[PDB]
Symmetry: D2
Subunit: 308 residues, 4 copies
Amino acid sequence: RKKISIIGAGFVGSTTAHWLAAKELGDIVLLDIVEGVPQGKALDLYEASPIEGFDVRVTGTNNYADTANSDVIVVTSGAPRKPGMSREDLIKVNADITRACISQAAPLSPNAVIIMVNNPLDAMTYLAAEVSGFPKERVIGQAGVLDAARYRTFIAMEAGVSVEDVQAMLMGGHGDEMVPLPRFSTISGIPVSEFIAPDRLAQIVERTRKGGGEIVNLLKTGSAYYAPAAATAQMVEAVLKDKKRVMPVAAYLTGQYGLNDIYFGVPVILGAGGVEKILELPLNEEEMALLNASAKAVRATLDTLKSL
Amino acid sequence: RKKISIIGAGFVGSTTAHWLAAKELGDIVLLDIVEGVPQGKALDLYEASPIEGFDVRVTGTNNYADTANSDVIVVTSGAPRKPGMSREDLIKVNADITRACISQAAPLSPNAVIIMVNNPLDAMTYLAAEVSGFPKERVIGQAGVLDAARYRTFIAMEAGVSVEDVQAMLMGGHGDEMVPLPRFSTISGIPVSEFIAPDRLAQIVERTRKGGGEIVNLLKTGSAYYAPAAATAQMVEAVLKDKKRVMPVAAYLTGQYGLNDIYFGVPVILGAGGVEKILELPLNEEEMALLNASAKAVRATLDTLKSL
Amino acid sequence: RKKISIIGAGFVGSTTAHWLAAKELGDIVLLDIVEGVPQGKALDLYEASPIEGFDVRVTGTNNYADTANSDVIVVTSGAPRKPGMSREDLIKVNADITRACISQAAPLSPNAVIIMVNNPLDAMTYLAAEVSGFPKERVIGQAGVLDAARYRTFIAMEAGVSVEDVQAMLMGGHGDEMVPLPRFSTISGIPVSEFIAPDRLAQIVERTRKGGGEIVNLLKTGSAYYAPAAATAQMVEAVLKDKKRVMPVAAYLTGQYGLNDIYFGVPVILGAGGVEKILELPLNEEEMALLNASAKAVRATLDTLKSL
Amino acid sequence: RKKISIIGAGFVGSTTAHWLAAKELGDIVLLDIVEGVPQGKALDLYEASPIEGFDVRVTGTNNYADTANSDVIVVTSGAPRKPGMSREDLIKVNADITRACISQAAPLSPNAVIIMVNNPLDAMTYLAAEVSGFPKERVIGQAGVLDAARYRTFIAMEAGVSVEDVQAMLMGGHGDEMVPLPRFSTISGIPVSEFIAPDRLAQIVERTRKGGGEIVNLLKTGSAYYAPAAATAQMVEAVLKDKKRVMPVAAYLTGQYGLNDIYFGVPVILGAGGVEKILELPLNEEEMALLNASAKAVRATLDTLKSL
Ligand SMILES: NC(=O)c1ccc[n+]([C@@H]2O[C@H](COP(=O)([O-])OP(=O)(O)OC[C@H]3O[C@@H](n4cnc5c(N)ncnc54)[C@H](O)[C@@H]3O)[C@@H](O)[C@H]2O)c1
Ligand SMILES: NC(=O)c1ccc[n+]([C@@H]2O[C@H](COP(=O)([O-])OP(=O)(O)OC[C@H]3O[C@@H](n4cnc5c(N)ncnc54)[C@H](O)[C@@H]3O)[C@@H](O)[C@H]2O)c1
Ligand SMILES: NC(=O)c1ccc[n+]([C@@H]2O[C@H](COP(=O)([O-])OP(=O)(O)OC[C@H]3O[C@@H](n4cnc5c(N)ncnc54)[C@H](O)[C@@H]3O)[C@@H](O)[C@H]2O)c1
Ligand SMILES: NC(=O)c1ccc[n+]([C@@H]2O[C@H](COP(=O)([O-])OP(=O)(O)OC[C@H]3O[C@@H](n4cnc5c(N)ncnc54)[C@H](O)[C@@H]3O)[C@@H](O)[C@H]2O)c1
Ligand SMILES: O=C(O)/C=C\C(=O)O
Ligand SMILES: O=C(O)/C=C\C(=O)O
Ligand SMILES: O=C(O)/C=C\C(=O)O
Ligand SMILES: O=C(O)/C=C\C(=O)O
């Protein structure tokens, strides 16, 4: 069977194990720094297997040796934000955690595809690629799938249609300057502008950018995990099943969109080899302007990163 | 449980029972004019239930009384074409069969949504609405979902991407003058023209229009059933689960696109109440020209219909 | 669509919503007394729908009016236990909570099947039946499905076989005195005693009885929720899809197994009408002695309850 | 991705592809000797993928070279029987077909697990093992899963319970002499004898034995394929996902049940390595007498085979 290791067994990591288990994609290893917690969550989920009918070994551990030879490594060990904070405010604590986790896991699974989740996403993904030394196509960050999912959900709710018929591309860094692309969003191939008024669509674009913060303010003691885990699981599935999915993920740019040496949310074809192709869309002046402002925000986090 | 009756237990009807059973949407009644055949197919499929794990009663019958109080009626009793024929060539034989089936089933399930499949689709759907006297929104024809699925498949194959990320709208009568709409087709919200060259996309549009005939010429003894059944099942699912799907189905027009008193392949929101809304797309001159040529072909079949 | 209301949006409640949404069984209403929490978890789960592909309306609320006319009501509002604590220790606190919830929800959904989860399970289910005034067969408690799932997981691990081929019955109150039944345990119809030696099987039985405590000790801050939620969801599903599942649940007894006027873990047929029939197994002397011991335990908590 | 080759694109073969595609287990290659037929069914099934949402490459062919390096090979190229005919009557025709297929496919996929379906099952599986020269544990026949499924369906119908809670073992050759085992039949761990009276259970056992004939008489033009295909697919799945399923299949015996040098229906653990272990049930006098009768039947066909 395929092997998937999830580093960090908190809200997002455990929920990610849940989505993956139900899919019977492969055996799962939940690792954490806290003793007992990952073992308990993995056993609890494993005990659900006879009810749901999936044959997947789910095991909790505190030892990186158990993650050896994984096909995919998911990183969800970062600290989450609380109300009033930005994802960037977590960069110091999480840079340390990320370096720690990647330095230990990466060497044990040299052929794995690493999927970063820790925030600030784009910067943490860059760090992981550096600490691991893995081919850039095998180190990606999850962010766009979740952001576009929030957008797609708001459209479905607004238009009163099935979430199964809404598609949307969203680019940029996983933050406030995120760039949802209405012009690149459709319902069964039909432009969303044909279903929703411009002013209303504008409010949806804004709600999408502040979507993470909306949940943080509701939960008050933590951030989102159901959709984030689903998004991560979808990317894991893309790799394990070599589905060649077209989705936005933080990938390493070498000139696309006029950007070099940076991890940025861009449309890619994701498969068994990780990022198999970075797509270069014909954005207009307004879109490019928003994208550049996003690339600037991301570069800003990378500059903070290098000063740590 | 919900009840679904499938009139005509041949290739498309039985395959449709298969797709539906696996979804555990409701009990299924397979009716046919031939004795034994529907009973055998329904029992064979029912015996697969312990293996797959679905609890759905699947029963074969030769008596319309068994289809009483169905939530959805699927009609697949028409004769299929052989190599060298057009769907229109079946209108005489199938007009009789359709009238026969609808006159018997419709009265027994007054609250059902009828989904026609018999070819020529648009004309047979018009006939069914007339013979049944049901509210027009509850009498629809399956055709666009299948046509757009063939198109979406060719795009996925051509672009080398996941079929899960391809969306496409296709309009018109279910025939040679069918109108696939490249401008209304995307991959994760991105126009298909960004993935495929115009000349290649043109060949795909053509293959889509002649897609049914392609299979007929390969099988030689019959026509397609796997995709047609999937398409039909998806529409059944849309109604039973009130999913508000946006898909192209033959619906009754009263002025949309400048067309009145005709069943034509158009984009609709499909739910528990059947067609809950007919969408009017801003087609350009070239598209409207193709659509009108299609509306003309359909009107031609309706004129043949009235002379029977 | 069917409507499911979950009272108590904590670990089990929210996780049950997750399992339920993935099955697209109906719209879900997550209610809690803490403001924002349910709204946040519901929105988060909702935003995952475009990724997973399920059309389910998940709404969080602090108002019981929103639960009106539900097909099923799940009660997961009770306080969980902390390490070194027995489920019975929660009786006073959870009796007040359970009473408050049932009294506000029952009147608004008179035709609903109530599934209790709050511990001590058996006594809370009884309290629910008494507060709702509902037909006894429409007020049941989840416990046996979870306990049996743990038991099945253990034997699957021990024997090295698929969890899909392991079934087992388990009876009694949800506590240390529960009674797993090895004699009524099989692997593809074959007695488990053929796969696991008596000594090891005895250990598995003991682990099952202490299974809940095992998780609480590992997590230290709370109790299990992945399997507990999957169990609750399988019961909700049995009801909504009228599957006629044969499973152990807490049902009201009037003489079965020689027990009367008590909610106790017994095998039943679960369907749209709730408990449609209580099965009466031919237990031997060994098993009955265990069952009677468990009954005395449940009776004791019932005595504590009636005296609160 | 995993690769599955189906030799014989008829009713069972094509239907197996359908069940397999829906599970997204791997790419499927449908091979047939008749030109166009496999290509047509494959394309048709492929065109259904955008509707169902599975990324599976289904290719039809008339060239064995395309089956090279498959993980699993399904053999469904045998001629089916017509009413008033026994499965044994197909031995000469199907021996030539089976021989021709195996000799061309085996060499190209030396690491594959071969699953025989052609009737007479037991004798064809033996012939396959002898022609391929493969390890006996990697050449098995489908029969018991189907027979047991029918038996389980009947008891589910009779008892009025979910097909998900019914398990049963069945042994022996795939024919009139097959041996269902009521003693090794349970409903959620409870003996079926507790649900169905002896007289009725005896009728169910008889129906199971004649189950295949029942379908052939109803269809008149061919034999079953929905359950047969689901059975074959569950076995393919057990192998590809290394599930360790406990199921009856035709395996090579070297003394188990006192039988040697014969492929016979026995319970096994099925996983990535094929038959990983043959279970030896403690059968009583009644059961062994039946098993020995069945063994003599299979041996007889084996005698006919070796003398062809
Ligand atoms: N779209 C996205 O990219 C996205 C979405 C949601 C959350 N996130 C981010 O993901 C991270 C996880 O969020 P969460 O809510 O699951 O948090 P959490 O606090 O629930 O879980 C993090 C887990 O990591 C563990 N941990 C800490 N240091 C570790 C180390 N060195 N090694 C192994 N495990 C360690 C903790 O003990 C904890 O169980 C946060 O940084 C959050 O902001 C990103
Ligand atoms: N996209 C579409 O709309 C679409 C796709 C595929 C096929 N079709 C059409 O659907 C029909 C069915 O195709 P098929 O391949 O399943 O054909 P088929 O010949 O396999 O099956 C038709 C079944 O109808 C039964 N039948 C005939 N008269 C009947 C009557 N009066 N009452 C009840 N049953 C009766 C037959 O006995 C037969 O079993 C054809 O007309 C075909 O062209 C439409
Ligand atoms: N029967 C079983 O098999 C089983 C399995 C697991 C847990 N349980 C029990 O289920 C209960 C819930 O466990 P948990 O881990 O989810 O706990 P939790 O503390 O995470 O969640 C309980 C939720 O109830 C809410 N709540 C409290 N009073 C309320 C009221 N009056 N109305 C509405 N909501 C209210 C809280 O605010 C909280 O969100 C516990 O009593 C636990 O012991 C039973
Ligand atoms: N073991 C079971 O439980 C079970 C269940 C059902 C059917 N069967 C048996 O399975 C076989 C297939 O049944 P069916 O209903 O699908 O039959 P079918 O006639 O529909 O299909 C057989 C296919 O094999 C093809 N074929 C013939 N010779 C070939 C060769 N040399 N190479 C490649 N393809 C070749 C045919 O052209 C045809 O498409 C029969 O022998 C039947 O008795 C076994
Ligand atoms: O807002 C957060 O902190 C986490 C969810 C996200 O990254 O969108
Ligand atoms: O071509 C046919 O006759 C049937 C398939 C379709 O209607 O596309
Ligand atoms: O032990 C607990 O408190 C919860 C899980 C269970 O009831 O098994
Ligand atoms: O009876 C037949 O020929 C095929 C079905 C089976 O083998 O059961």
